[PDB]
Amino acid sequence: QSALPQPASVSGSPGQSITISCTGTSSDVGGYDLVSWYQHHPGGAPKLIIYEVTNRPSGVSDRFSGSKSGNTASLTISGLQAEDEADYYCSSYASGSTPRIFGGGTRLTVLGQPKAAPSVTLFPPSSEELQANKATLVCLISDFYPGAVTVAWKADSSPVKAGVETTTPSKQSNNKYAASSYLSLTPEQWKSHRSYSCQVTHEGSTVEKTVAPTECS
Amino acid sequence: QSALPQPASVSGSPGQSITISCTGTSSDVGGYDLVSWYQHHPGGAPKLIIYEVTNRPSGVSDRFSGSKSGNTASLTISGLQAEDEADYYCSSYASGSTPRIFGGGTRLTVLGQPKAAPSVTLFPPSSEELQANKATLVCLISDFYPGAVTVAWKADSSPVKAGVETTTPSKQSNNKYAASSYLSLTPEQWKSHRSYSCQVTHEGSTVEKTVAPTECS
């Protein structure tokens, strides 16, 4: 129904202050003092941070405040922290059938910019994996920031053409991102190339990790 | 703000009925007749589908029913259609701090192809990494559908709370999902235990894989 438009996304640095608008009308936003803001970290249960346009639960950080001017309501966050990076929604009582209409969501990106190196870990294939006859060197990269890195492989000092499958990066609990890289292989092929390696390029930086095929040699 | 426990995921074939559950206390769910449900297509504005336990907003499909008994409430979607796939949340009015409490949500995945049990591959810490005075294990979950699983780690029949980091499952070419998880251990811990295990749950069925200290297959 009458969906309240919100900015698709705002971004700010720590300690700064963002504010999110909830476009509306006389029938909803500017019709009653019944707007609410919710904070949602995908995967978790939404939190009710704002209700009745300006109220705030006796437990929600006072860095969060709301209000409206005409047919527009808006949440404003002060002293951006880490937790703050989530999705924000506004909802409101309306004058029609619908008991309450919701905003379309605003994703707040709290940078922080505390840049960190991609501690990379290269794994050799596994024993069990050898049975059905499979082999895979898994390169683990974590605790890095920003969540932007490009990985490559050096198959025996030579970047031989192969099949590398760099996963869809994800954000960990510690905020820092963590990705990985896989280079599936074959029997005699992993025995042939004397030593495989991983190469994580993190913002004008590059760390290597080599793993040699073996059995306690 | 003690979230309303909900089922992480649910699946149903086109045309079937499904019931999602919301569990609370007499202080909120069993204290009022103010339980709401919302359908939400990620990246979209949440929609109010059920309210006051069973009330339904006009224009909303009578395929969506709500009911409650005791301190548990539950939504039911009958005659499933592909377009019904979305996240469903349930909320209730509270007596304490915050007035309204929410549930963790539930991804309703309507089956569109046969179910797919995952492939789990565990990895022992690389000796290379062991000399760096650090150990980390990796568990690979792949080839599964629907795209939802839970990963638990074990240290000799003993649950490993801290030190874990699982990733969100991502869809792949074959339209099945993959995902990973890694546990960070000091080298001591590693050799300190008989073995470690990776428990992977998918649609009820759980599989495990074990790996023991020092060896070269």
Q: Which fold has domain A113-213?
A: Immunoglobulin-like (2.60.40)
Note whether B22 and B3 are within 8 A (CB).
Answer: no
Q: Which fold has domain B2-112?
A: Immunoglobulin-like (2.60.40)
Q: What resolution does the deposited structure have, in angstroms?
A: 2.9
Whether A103 and B45 lie within 8 Å, measured CB to CB? yes
- Residue B190 corresponds to which amino acid? W
φ, ψ at B86 (rounded to 5°) = -175, 180
* Pairwise CA distance, residues A207 & A119, whole Å: 8
Residue count of chain A: 217
**H helix intervals, chain A:** 127-131, 187-192
For residue B183, give how far its alpha carbon lies from the nearest alpha carbon of chain A (Å): 11
* Beta-ladder partners of B66: B75
Method: X-ray
Which B residues, 50 through 89, put their C-beta within 8 Å of a C-beta on chain A?
51, 55, 57-59, 89
Coil, helix or strand for B133?
Answer: coil
Task: Please check whether residue A172 touches B, CB under 8 A.
Answer: yes
For residue B121, give how far its alpha carbon lies from the nearest alpha carbon of chain A (Å): 7
**H helix intervals, B72-208:** 127-131, 187-192
CA-nearest of A51, A54, A183, A34 to A122 is A183
Domain with CATH 2.60.40.10 in chain B: 2-112, 113-213
* Beta-ladder partners of B181: B139, B166
* Residues whose CB falls within 8 Å of the CB of residue A16, separated by 6 or more in sequence, listed in order: A79, A80
Task: Please check whether residue A126 touches B, CB under 8 A.
Answer: yes
DSSP chain B: ---B---SEEEE-TT--EEEEEE--TTTTTT-S-EEEEEE-TTS--EEEEBTTTB--TTS-TTEEEEEETTEEEEEE-S--GGG-EEEEEEEE-SSSSSEEEB--EEEEE--S--B--EEEEEPPPHHHHHTT-EEEEEEEEEEBSS--EEEEESSSSB--TTEEEPPPEE-TTS-EEEEEEEEE-HHHHHHSS-EEEEEEETTEEEEEEE-SS---
* Residues whose CB falls within 8 Å of the CB of residue A136, separated by 6 or more in sequence, listed in order: A125, A126, A129, A182, A183, A184, A185, B121, B140
Residues of A in contact with B208 (CB under 8 A): none
* Pairwise CA distance, residues A96 & A90, whole Å: 18
Which A residues, 176 through 215, put their C-beta within 8 Å of a C-beta on chain B?
178, 180, 209-211, 214-215
Whether B43 and A124 lie within 8 Å, measured CB to CB? no
Burial class of residue B86, CB neighbours in 10 A (0-12, 13-18, 19+): buried
Q: Where are the beta strands (DSSP E) in chain A?
A: 9-12, 18-22, 35-40, 47-51, 64-69, 72-77, 87-92, 101-102, 106-110, 119-123, 135-144, 150-155, 170-171, 177-185, 196-201, 206-211
Task: Tell me which residue has tokens 């099945």.
Answer: B176
Closest A-chain CA to B39 = A102
* Pairwise CA distance, residues A205 & A53, whole Å: 48
Among B3, B38, B123, beta carbon nearest to A123: B123
Coil, helix or strand for B82?
Answer: helix
Coil, helix or strand for A28?
Answer: coil
* Pairwise CA distance, residues B30 & B35, whole Å: 9
**CA dihedral (A182, A184, A185, A187) positive or negative:** positive
* Pairwise CA distance, residues B14 & B32, whole Å: 34
CA A103 to chain CA centroid, Å, is 21
- Residue B32 corresponds to which amino acid? Y
CB half-sphere exposure, B183, CA atoms < 13 A = 24
Note whether A128 and A145 are within 8 A (CB).
Answer: no
* Pairwise CA distance, residues A90 & A38, whole Å: 6
Whether A45 and B104 lie within 8 Å, measured CB to CB? yes
